[PDB]
Amino acid sequence: MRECISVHVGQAGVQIGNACWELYCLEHGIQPDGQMPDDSFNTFFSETGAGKHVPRAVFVDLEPTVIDEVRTGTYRQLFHPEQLITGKEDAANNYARGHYTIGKELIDLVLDRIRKLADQCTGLQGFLIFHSFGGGTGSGFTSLLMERLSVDYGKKSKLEFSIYPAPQVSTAVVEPYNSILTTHTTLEHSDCAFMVDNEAIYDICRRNLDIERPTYTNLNRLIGQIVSSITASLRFDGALNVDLTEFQTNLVPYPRIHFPLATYAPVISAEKAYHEQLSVAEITNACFEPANQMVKCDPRHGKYMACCLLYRGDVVPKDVNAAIATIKTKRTIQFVDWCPTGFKVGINYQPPTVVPGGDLAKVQRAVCMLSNTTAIAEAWARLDHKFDLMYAKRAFVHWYVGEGMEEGEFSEAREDMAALEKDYEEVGMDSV
Amino acid sequence: MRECISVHVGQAGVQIGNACWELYCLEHGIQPDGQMPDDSFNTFFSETGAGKHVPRAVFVDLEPTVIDEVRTGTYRQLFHPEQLITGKEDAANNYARGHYTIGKELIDLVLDRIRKLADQCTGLQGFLIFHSFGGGTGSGFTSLLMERLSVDYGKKSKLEFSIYPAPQVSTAVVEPYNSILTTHTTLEHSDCAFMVDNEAIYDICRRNLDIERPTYTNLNRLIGQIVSSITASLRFDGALNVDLTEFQTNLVPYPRIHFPLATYAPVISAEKAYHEQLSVAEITNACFEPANQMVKCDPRHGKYMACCLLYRGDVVPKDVNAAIATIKTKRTIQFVDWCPTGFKVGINYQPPTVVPGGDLAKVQRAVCMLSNTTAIAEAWARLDHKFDLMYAKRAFVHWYVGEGMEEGEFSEAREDMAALEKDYEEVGMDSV
Amino acid sequence: TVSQICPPPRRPLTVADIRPGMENERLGVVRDSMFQNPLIVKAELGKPRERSCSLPGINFNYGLYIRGLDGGVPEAIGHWNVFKQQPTCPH
Amino acid sequence: MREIVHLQAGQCGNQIGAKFWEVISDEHGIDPTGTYHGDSDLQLERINVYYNEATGGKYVPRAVLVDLEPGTMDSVRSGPFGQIFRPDNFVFGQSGAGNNWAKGHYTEGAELVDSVLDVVRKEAESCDCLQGFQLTHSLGGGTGSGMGTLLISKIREEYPDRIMNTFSVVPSPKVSDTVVEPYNATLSVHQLVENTDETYCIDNEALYDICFRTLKLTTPTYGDLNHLVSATMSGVTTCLRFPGQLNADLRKLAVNMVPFPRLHFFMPGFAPLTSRGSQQYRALTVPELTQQMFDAKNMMAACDPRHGRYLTVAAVFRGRMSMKEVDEQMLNVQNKNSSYFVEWIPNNVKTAVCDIPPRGLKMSATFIGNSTAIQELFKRISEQFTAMFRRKAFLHWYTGEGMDEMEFTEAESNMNDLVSEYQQYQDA
Amino acid sequence: MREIVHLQAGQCGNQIGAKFWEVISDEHGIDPTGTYHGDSDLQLERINVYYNEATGGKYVPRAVLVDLEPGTMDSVRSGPFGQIFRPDNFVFGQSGAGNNWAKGHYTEGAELVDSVLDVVRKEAESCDCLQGFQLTHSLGGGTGSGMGTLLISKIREEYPDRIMNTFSVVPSPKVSDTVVEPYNATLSVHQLVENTDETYCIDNEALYDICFRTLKLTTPTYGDLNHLVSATMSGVTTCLRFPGQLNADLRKLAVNMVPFPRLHFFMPGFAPLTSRGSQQYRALTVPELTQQMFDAKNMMAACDPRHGRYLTVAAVFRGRMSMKEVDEQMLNVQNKNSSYFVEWIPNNVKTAVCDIPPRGLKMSATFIGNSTAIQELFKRISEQFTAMFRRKAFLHWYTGEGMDEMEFTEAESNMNDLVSEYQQYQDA
Amino acid sequence: PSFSIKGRSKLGKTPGPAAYRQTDVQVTKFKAPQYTMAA
Ligand SMILES: Nc1nc2c(ncn2[C@@H]2O[C@H](COP(=O)(O)OP(=O)(O)OP(=O)(O)O)[C@@H](O)[C@H]2O)c(=O)[nH]1
Ligand SMILES: Nc1nc2c(ncn2[C@@H]2O[C@H](COP(=O)(O)OP(=O)(O)OP(=O)(O)O)[C@@H](O)[C@H]2O)c(=O)[nH]1
């Protein structure tokens, strides 16, 4: 009865997707090919005939390879042969190439699949889009996608999972530009864009998870576990379950300011705990430690506004309060003067699953913490200043302006960027 | 008892006739030999003394090749040796040839056998023509048939399944001539002229039937399922069976306005139907979409008038009636203000029998929509505009007048099209 | 798949199913794999795409057809059966 | 004794009627064949009311099946109960009863009425005190409405006194199976507010609701819907086939349930309409069937009973109850909801208690209530008419079988008249 | 004769209501099936209070299960006593709640309210005599706070003289499991102060504290936590069913407790709560049962009765006891702790003694009191409101449905009025 | 017992089949070539 259409867009998304759909299939119980050898599957799957559980996804890529490999892999006999919409020419790291040019050609074939996936649904609690603030396919398309879906489908909470440009490491030369433009078409057509940055994921899996040389694969499984956790309540059982509509009213604290972080804490190396098992008391502190933050932004330089702590496993109802208490007393952890409360517990029962051949252990607890801390202000201020350096001497604008984007748009985007700045500054200045 | 006389005329109609009779044979237990290894064959299979089931049809074309193909091909021991009415010249893509020359040297030979068909069993519900609007026998011979059979027999409903010219796709340079020249003698004696295009089915065979190389045989089996559905409610038992003289009474409001549309809904291959649950909810939601209309025509531009939804196979009637109430509350299929109703329903108890070794998946459900919308006027202006570029200097006219033709009908057919264009136009506006 | 109706399932095209004449009579090496992925797979004269996968037989019923535990009106009206107090074994 | 002639004309009625014959056969213990296989004498004592007799005891059903398309004929024939029907009574006519009001009332339809009334007579004569006419039909089609208003006209002239107990499936908003129903409806109501006394208006838009929110089913077919109708059909005649503390015949269900002459369109309903799931968590007491009798979700017709001060209601309680309860439980309901009941009629309830309960439910009831709420049902089809008339819609097939614009204006006029009548009292 | 219904509203109240029907059904012998397997006869003589008899001997709990998400009654149906309820009063909305008092009361709330009032009434009419109702809700979120306070609104005019009992987990000071919980309680407790006579304010902090200082249990879940709640839930209405000495129903408690109509916020407590490790020296004397009631550690609310005088004490003693020893100990608590008891009221306790103790425990009591120190709870949550509301944090998602700033400045003013008049009598 | 009549409760998304102007084969699927003249 609860459904969540998943629009995996761009290489980044299709990749995070094949990591998330494996995690999902295992959790429920379908072999990578459908055919389960119960209402859990429903949230992320739909049965059709003699055991052909198909997913609720729509893989989208203006380029034709990341989805081609999904079409000729092991999960080939799972996704509908029509849900994996590919395309032709790519988006050459060009917001314009997607939003205005190339992109404007597949938008129809994606929103009609979205249409079909939702007429078969009986309770769309929210869409799950997987984008990346790096290039057109992940920026421009997801923008057009959002705008259309925003009105076409309606108030259905479109929640998105984004990979923000890291404050030092990057795989592009135009990322400052691409990302700022994405915000102009996301700060108003989304409700919670749980962000993440590879640089930090490449440290979680380098300081905690003892794993050097991590590839994309071993950096999306962790992203999969965060998303799996935020969608576990509306899938299995629990004690203080949180529906997708409550991860909003209990997180976003003002019209905008809708960008939660993430901190799965019991990330434990495979060959490690032989005589130990984390307990709520410390598993909580772990997520607040300024070193598990999957999005780089000194969490101390700010003021945690609201906080949602999803506990999956043998978490007891009264020990989460013990944790909450100490955390609130810890001086460092500063909570805004406007929010006297500041937590939302979710004691689900299903223990974090184990990708058969990954880097995670079998911990009987978890603390996926989605937090909204002012800190992210700086975490995007960096990108904003990087934009300043390039635009100043009109650099790489020739390419975007020559695909259908008035050069004016860039400046207007910085206006909306500098807006969320004063906004994040404002949502902190202690009440007089 | 029940009867439908299927007259197959022209290059196109004979080809549809080869494929549509495959469906009628395979539904029943008549092998192409002719012998059967109860009362459901009495509409399309006249019984004999031995146990043979000679079909109720007449095959006629001036071109020897198409009938000699049937007179050499496998369906040959079942056909009456004389009903294969073979001409001896060709209609030559020419309305002149078929209506005022060698057409009227084959009339008595075809009108004798079609008269011999009525007197051998009772209950003639109606009349089934299979032709094309293109250039020759499907326009010349078809015209003289259905004007003459409208006085010799009497009044019984005359149905045609023509192949209208696409606004692009065309295999002759004078189709618009020989299509407006067969609308004066169509508009006054055909009760429902079910036009079927070529360009659309090319697209339908590509997106949904997933053929990027479709030949004429595949184009005619899909039409063969269309003609099977309307003739299955008088052939098999059901729950809301329609009859061949009552879906006239509910699809054609005005006497001039009578041209319908057609759409088979489970039109999808094997590697998608195992992936999809063809339930009642979206099997009625696939007829209304602009990608399954078998005539290339914008179904949104132009508001809908009447929809005769021929269901087939196992559908539960509540699931139908609730799904119909959905198609009303959604706001792109605009229905007429002059009828708050507009949804005729009907359920048979026999599932679709796809020809084995065929593209179509074998599905125990079908919705054969028979639409009637004010959009096909916009699909008539396209052939009308073709007239206004070849009549400005009167090209390709010397074959017409040369055999024998007045030049009077050419202007007279245009004001008939101007009448039919204006007729499908006044039935859209509101009267305050 | 295989258990889905005991007639054999629709096998994807293999080496031995290649005949002379069609456009897919492929020059070079002929192993079981290139006809099982679609970008080497070309089109033939009015056929579906090479299914690339193990699909069930011709007579398999596609889609879900619910057979609910029912009987309906002459069960809800035709018989009034109240909860039966089952006699427990004497402990 | 008191006999009831049963005509089955139409596509809907034909099946509703056949279904009724099973829900009347079981009660009198008639096996599909024709022999009696019951257990009591309290069923053969009235095997001469809805059934006739035969050399041996093949109690054949006194019915007259009619349809200008031999489809339903074999459909019914080859069914749960077919053989029993009289091969001769199967008067049909290989023709085309195209959904058109001017099909079975003016053209083809009229060329059979003669042979139909010929059968109707044979039976009517070979019987003692005849009482009423049981036509199962549909007020939204060709035969159903056209041939219906014909057979009923040419029977209220050959048999004036006898009452007329029809059962029609009035058109509605959601459920829509034909396109020219608005017409077929209005045209039929004309000759139904002038030649009937017992028209039980059933719908398919609320009956389906009963079979989805009360008997919570997953596959409500056409047999299911008809079985609910068949129940009330075999319920309003229970006090004419089985004993009872206080009895009530079909004329008693007329002098009491028809306030003014024209207001005779009533709504049906049954009582034990709960699903198996809860059919063990709830008891079946006289002080319980009454809420399952006075609830919009137990009425087999739409029209919120609230928007309309109900005029006269009647409940043929069945089984073995105590009138002390029946009387008071009815009385309570009356004064409790006095505002929704009428005032100019002091008492507004009729209690009829039988002694024989429907196979199973030890206590059942059939609710027949005349309310000022049926007006909406007769106003929705009126607005429908307007639209499909202001711009003469599918009239090119009506005014082509012998019809006239005048007839439509006449029907709609007489139609809106009934609305005014069911309102000129409502306001009071 | 006597009746009370129960209205499970919210994720809290439904699971507390699961505990309600497993401590009551075991108190008088009903099994998971519904059959009576008990020993004493004086437990079926008052079964009609909480249960409705069915055919064959099954007793169904008269109780609706209200929510705005199907998940929490999928849980209670799958629980050990999830077959005892009618499957008709399992009413559920399909769209979610989002812990919004706004959205569960004005927009997504106003779809189930007619449906729940249809099934509230069908039980509440089916009586001999009503005294009142029972609604276990949250006061800290969506379905419990929003829908729950709409029920106590619409159910009030419809029966305007019945004992409307509402149970609520007040949002704890330190413990916070909802970020919008001062934006849910303040607007909900606004409506609670007029259309509710008995409301027993419980918390979650002290319920944990009773489990860690009295029960010594190092793993209190949400099962054993609500068993302590369900102990009070029984005890105040054990005098309704079970017979004995000097009696007191609910109207009695009220008259002998609520001084002025606004001031009706109560605090519960279970007297014979002992650690599970105790096995020896089993003599629960009355002079030690009076000490575990008036101490501020068995108080089931966050506020302590030391920082303010009482108003009225109710002690529903259970078991067989000599009321001389009961009364003399009601005296000493007044005299010894003289400052923490009212002087303008001469006698500040109510005594009620049953004859039937809880299952197991030979002697028990339920402490119901209203200290004037719960204004500390109402002032702290006002401070939790005046820091959020002053610069409008979560309001952009509560004004989205159409509730503007007018309803918030009036609720806080009524909140301050609830603080002010509750405190002006502590000064005396 | 009291008793009273009740019923007709109000209770008991996708934009359109239509809209969504549907595109052609030269988008996500194979393109047949163009064939200029020779010069
Ligand atoms: N977490 C994670 N991030 C990825 C992965 N693959 C790519 N990225 C991120 O994506 C950025 C590269 O740009 P993308 O957004 O993937 O490019 P795109 O989605 O194809 O959009 P275009 O470049 O315009 O075609 C890198 O900076 C990475 O941060 C992945 O597998 N996991
Ligand atoms: N769908 C479908 N259309 C066909 C088929 N064969 C022919 N057509 C249509 O028929 C047109 C060819 O001209 P026709 O109308 O058949 O020729 P004709 O009327 O028989 O005239 P003559 O060939 O001179 O006898 C084409 O444009 C097609 O659209 C077929 O097998 N399937």
Ligand SMILES: Nc1nc2c(ncn2[C@@H]2O[C@H](COP(=O)(O)OP(=O)(O)O)[C@@H](O)[C@H]2O)c(=O)[nH]1
């Ligand atoms: N409730 C119900 N209605 C039916 C059934 N069968 C047919 N109908 C109704 O009959 C109406 C059509 O009547 P029609 O066929 O035109 O009457 P005709 O003159 O006998 O052909 C439709 O609106 C259906 O709703 C049935 O089994 N149950």
Ligand SMILES: Nc1nc2c(ncn2[C@@H]2O[C@H](COP(=O)(O)OP(=O)(O)O)[C@@H](O)[C@H]2O)c(=O)[nH]1
């Ligand atoms: N005693 C008890 N309290 C609960 C339970 N579930 C939640 N709570 C309390 O209710 C508060 C949250 O309210 P919530 O259940 O989210 O509101 P609702 O879902 O709209 O009914 C928390 O502070 C919990 O302490 C339960 O099962 N038992």
Ligand SMILES: [Mg+2]
């Ligand atoms: Mg030809």
